[PDB]
């Protein structure tokens, strides 16, 4: 039923065969005299494959038995080429085991016998899986780079190790170094592998991308390797001049911004689930980038698009507060008086006196809903909430408006259930537009509550109004007109009014549902306020409160750059073509030092 | 559409012209042989202005190319005098670039050729703007002082550098040092520039004020430079005697207190938006000052003025609780019974039995409102809330009282809307008078809540009473008389009473507005209490809670010293005239050392 049990069963099974096979046992214990008393007379199987398809040399290489390994090579030099014939270690040679163990003399001897420096260890243990503690790759050169042994690295290059070699996952020796825990020390090894590159501008090793379309520089950002990212940044920044403390450095800004449909560091950071990758935006070439993208273009277009959405939702409620109308007509208010409806449905509701003002208003609510779907539906085909569930709500709001239209033209009785959902989904999606020390942050987070509060009540008071605009105000008239309805709901937002409560009669199916959602949102905002009031002052967790919002702003800034056309929102940085720099866009960033 | 893009475009444009111009390129790369192969045959333009109006020497000075700069000076000595003819660096000479780079040999050579030590670099990059990383000034002497190179400082003084020189912003070399980040090291440079002063008591360099009326000593306080402030304080304090550990030092206390209409350190600290400047009050010459100003004179006059305001507001409500009276008269309570008013308006309300007791009370409410305007309106002409929005509320309260008077004499029906606003604005402005370890601070902040609570209810219960004194107590009688009204509102302050809630009838326009403000203030005080209960115990943020109140007390102490006459509130410190000290007021401060 599992897999980890198998390899745990095999390692125990391996030590069994070593304990049984006297050749393998002598290769483990480095019993030199027992190898001569076994290989010359009475010759035993020397190509003896153990439990993991290992030769006697593989066991002599696992335990760094140089004396025992040299006897196994002089009596049978063909053991050097032999790889592990198992499934867990398919491809691993005696050289791979000697490289990771940093056995320079055994590596020197294995290379002297002519070991393959291009052997791919494609075994299941060497995979990049969470159940494998190390990921070094496949080639023995890739092993030497990860163990930090610069001596074996160059010693393998001298015997024809291809640095351009990629594993099953399309990772070069450079990609794998970035996926190593020792970040500060891998920078030293990374520069060693680069020195053996072809030296030509074309076919560079740092440009060879991952199988998932990630150059090593780009992979460092997505993986959140801060030390590798800053190191690789040194090779793509030019210091313009030195003016005392000022150091105007010109950054590359090539693989850090968008033209790639999906290839761009910014998009890969805001859409990845990796918590460590969020720190990459904050680096000295990137933090200047998104800060310029939000000060200009970003913030104004977000509030311009906001004011357009505030007007589009207040118009939808303008057509709801004055919904269509005939009183009950039916005597159904006499039997089963528990239902006191004065239901209102309307078809030749063409009769126009002030009804065309709402009709053109209802037409705005329709043409705006399809436009919402014309910018979100073609976008789902090409989904990570960093930046708020605004997209999940904006598509379900337009769905309720279309259902209300489908509700219309058929004269259905349940015209309230799909229309009321659009009121809360339309308003509470406005509070997402709130993206525009402990003192001002308490006040800063308090203004988010004051914005999120007034938005919630304006969506539930308009809802509760429709829920009891048809019903009778004789009993339970908490929302008999709009001005009240807002005031009742506002007090209901603080639990001052006892909640529309009535059990003699019955009240529509939507009140027992809409009021249930209103009671939960009211406490979560008041719980999120307390955390915004205490979490802001407790400790520097206000920073943790802080870059989550900053990352939400960066995630929103990248969102506004995808759908907006090229005529608006010009490209960041400065193009290089005349003034001479080759048509990449560079960012001029200067810093003072103290 | 921006400006930072331009200079980013120009620096890229600069490197283009350097890359193109072989003379400028040779000046950058220090190509000595390429300068001789360009200047002697085949002579090229040597006065070649680059992209930023720079000469070949300016480029040879930017990159510290001494060998290349000396060839450009021997073949064309007129390049030394030439300044940058650009807009970004208008005025910068080859000496300015050699001073900041601390190139002593190039500075020695430029001075030997006779470079202007008084050249003002008035370029746009050298401005004191937030988009400029450094502000050093204009003169090359001011550059040497900011880079900490005391060798170039004296070397420039030897060639006639004027220390008395001011930039466009009227800043001497001393003002600029205070605006430098390296505070601990600028104190060393500051004493060097003072040694070259005229040595005369008159025309001292430390007395030359800013263009915005700030001596360097005064600027250190407004800017919050603690290291410079304590350093400059050493020269204006005299140790009276040494008595073992005791060291009675006599402080100057001249530029730290008021006679200057607006010139005084205290006023400049409490009115500036700079958060760092608040720490200056707390220094050892200033913290003793405001502490003496608040123990005596400050605290008593604040509570005396408080008790006068408590009586002035309780008298205004005394005339409201017994407002004027005729019942409805009209049959309008029969049709549209939704309005159950028993409206009360009165003109020959002269008829006097107990009505003169209120008339003289109404006369107090008028003569007091104009006095409030006679001490605040002439003060707005000569506005920062540090110390609470008491001034913003005290002027709008007196505005409502005057409107109520204008409401009167015309027999208007809306006599409640402007009168009720004065009840909450009159009381809730009292809680501002609350300025009078974790244990006693929890109790200290709890007594602020107990004071702010009882003040809010006494303003809203009196309001809610007037809102329903005219209305009918048959239905919704939460405030039928004053003793109740207080009790209902008190319970309403804790959300125990369901809130005056009624939907059958209608209730005046002021209840749906006054009760909305009452529900928000009730939760903010209870939210501010929780933070006062947890924030006080969490960590030493109670100190952060702490000096904000202390600064509010200091801001209030300076407020009480401006309007009070000279006969009250004597001047701080002790005058020097006979006993011999020259008519400045000194503060005697002694300290013990351990
Ligand atoms: C010890 C085993 N014997 C052997 O000859 N090779 C194996 C080496 C084990 C390394 C497993 C690496 C991994 O966890 O992926
Ligand atoms: C490098 C430029 N070339 C040059 O000849 N002078 C400039 C010096 C730049 C300093 C900008 C100072 C500031 O940021 O205000
Ligand atoms: Gd009833
Ligand atoms: Gd009744």
From Swiss-Prot, chains A, B:
Residues 322-358, 409-414, 469-481, 502-512 are extracellular. A motif (Selectivity filter) lies at residues 497-501. ANK repeats lie at residues 18-48, 52-81, 90-119, 136-165, 169-210, 212-241. GO terms for molecular function: calcium channel activity; calcium-activated cation channel activity; calmodulin binding; identical protein binding; metal ion binding. One of its GO terms (cellular component) is calcium channel complex. It is found in: Cell membrane. The keyword Membrane applies. The chain crosses the membrane at residues 301-321, 359-381, 389-408, 415-434, 446-468, 513-533. Ca(2+) binds at residue 498. It comes from the Eukaryota. Homotetramer. Probably also forms heterotetramers with TRPV5. Interacts with TRPV5. Interacts with S100A10 and probably with the ANAX2-S100A10 heterotetramer. The interaction with S100A10 is required for the trafficking to the plasma membrane. Interacts with calmodulin. Interacts with BSPRY. Interacts with TCAF1 and TCAF2. Calcium selective cation channel that mediates Ca(2+) uptake in various tissues, including the intestine. Important for normal Ca(2+) ion homeostasis in the body, including bone and skin. The channel is activated by low internal calcium level, probably including intracellular calcium store depletion, and the current exhibits an inward rectification. Inactivation includes both a rapid Ca(2+)-dependent and a slower Ca(2+)-calmodulin-dependent mechanism; the latter may be regulated by phosphorylation. In vitro, is slowly inhibited by Mg(2+) in a voltage-independent manner. This is Transient receptor potential cation channel subfamily V member 6. It comes from Rattus norvegicus. The gene is Trpv6.
